[PDB]
């Protein structure tokens, strides 16, 4: 019943530099791994900007990764097995809420 | 600047083509990092919208998503490709793999 490309656990591993399994090079596993996490987060952040979270023009990419990493660190194993993107949306919404 | 998005459509199209990692000097590594970014950006959008904007995640291979998105971005004029990539990914997925 898993159909998602990244789980929360895998996105957390990507941020930590651990999600380039098909890369044999060392000390360039890290570059590919964090490129995946940054780009996955960017997909969710770009799509949801101005709807689920606000202030895209005043937030640096590194700040998005930091908030998401903190949030994923808060999640128990059952939530981290679910799709990563919903967790990114939740992190952005609590971090950078839109005025209701 | 009016632009707040991390990837434009033009940048996602360049990433799929292996040309969005300018601070990576080894050519093969530039290509690997670039396509890692495109795959992960698309995955963020695809995972978030699965079962709502597009359907079939269990049966469609990741490479098929990239192929449909690349075709779709190739359909867009330059002004539209300057907009956020994620909404273009959602549009590509919705026309390619519609729900109900």
Author numbering:
A (entry chain A): 2 to 101
B (entry chain B): 1 to 100
Lines quoted from the article behind this entry:
The crystal structure of AtTai4 was determined at 1.55 Å resolution. The α2 helix (residues 52–74) contributes to dimer formation in the asymmetric unit, which is consistent with the size-exclusion chromatography results indicating that AtTai4 exists as a dimer in solution. Superimposition of AtTai4 alone and AtTai4 bound to AtTae4 resulted in a root-mean-square deviation (r.m.s.d.) value of 0.8 Å, indicating that no structural changes occur upon complex formation. AtTai4 shares 32.3% amino-acid sequence identity with SmTai4.
